[PDB]
Design a protein around this ligand. Structure first.
Ligand SMILES: O=C1NC(=O)[C@@]2(C=C(c3ccc(O)cc3)SCC2)S1
Length: 134
């Protein structure tokens, strides 16, 4: 009974494009890129009241964030950046901005057909990651 309803569930990665290049742009080192690029995460999204939780589970790392839309939080990313994050809903798209060391990257999550599409942008580099229901 909220529009973020269509994100809720357990999702499995089914394709990735340009993710190594995105990770290079973000500053991820060689060994982490190689192992992280191999991961096939499940993304688990849940909502309880105003609090959204997004978990990523893979053989590389298990991560979890919980947040309220529009309210900044500190996040330690899977690649160990300490970032300040804000996630908003913009026309039905979850828009996640991470700020650190004068840099910024944006991760958009959207429902498209039966998929959850994740678009990650750092400067001119975009990666697209497609998830299906698990
Ligand atoms: O599919 C996705 N789900 C996520 O949470 C993303 C993963 C990231 C990442 C993970 C591990 C790593 O070593 C370096 C970056 S940053 C972009 C957002 S893409």
């Amino acid at each position: 009974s909220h529009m973020c309803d269509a994100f809720v569930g357990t999702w499995k990665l089914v394709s990735s494009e340009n993710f190594d290049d995105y990770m290079k742009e973000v500053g991820v080192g060689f060994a982490t890129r190689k192992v992280a690029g191999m991961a096939k995460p499940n993304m688990i999204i849940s909502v309880n009241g105003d609090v959204i939780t997004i978990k990523s589970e893979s053989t590389f790392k298990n991560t979890e964030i919980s947040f309220i839309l529009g309210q900044e939080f500190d996040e330690v990313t899977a690649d160990d950046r300490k970032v300040k994050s804000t996630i908003t809903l913009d026309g039905g798209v979850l828009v996640h901005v991470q700020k650190w060391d004068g840099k910024s990257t944006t991760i958009k999550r959207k429902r498209e057909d039966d998929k959850l599409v994740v678009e990650c942008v750092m400067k001119g580099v975009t990666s697209t990651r497609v998830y299906e229901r698990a």
